[PDB]
Structures are given as C-alpha cells and as structure tokens.
Amino acid sequence: SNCVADYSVLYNSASFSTFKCYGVSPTKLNDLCFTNVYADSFVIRGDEV
C-alpha cells in the first residue's frame, strides 16, 4: 500500500516459469490502480503449480 508498483520489472523477468493472470492481463498492470495488492508467498512441488 501507499506505493508505486512497476509490474514490467516482474513480467519482463525471464526467470519466471509462469505468470498466469485471471482478471487482468500482465501488459495492462501499469495502467491500473488498486486499494491493496496482497502478495501471498510459499513453496510447493512443481507438479502442483
């Protein structure tokens, strides 16, 4: 919250195996404003993503 969110810094990072976006498209994310982002972080098996 109370910050500027560059999402091209994420989307242009070739390190990501997927970037699945369900109610937004990743190239639109810099055009957007939101109340909070809520980042959830955890590790799983690759068979389960």
């Binding site: 070739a14 498209s25 990743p26 190239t27």
Partner: protein
Amino acid sequence: RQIAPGQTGKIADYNYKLPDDFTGCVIAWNSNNLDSKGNYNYLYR
C-alpha cells in the same frame, strides 16, 4: 504452447503472434535427433 490464437510469452507476444481469429493448424514435433549439438544458432527477437 505459445503458438495458439491468444496465448502469450517471449515468442508469441513479440514475433510470431497468431491472429485472434486464426483458422489453421499448428503442427509441431521434437528435432533433437537432427538439430542438437549446444546449438546457439537458433534465435529470437
């Protein structure tokens, strides 16, 4: 899997973009028995 009418990624969103209404077939196969060496020549913009 990027070569479909509306998929996205480092190939499809830049160079070989298919039409949103693409009528056609995409036929693909592995080529390790022919083209592997590595073979740093096969290349993308």
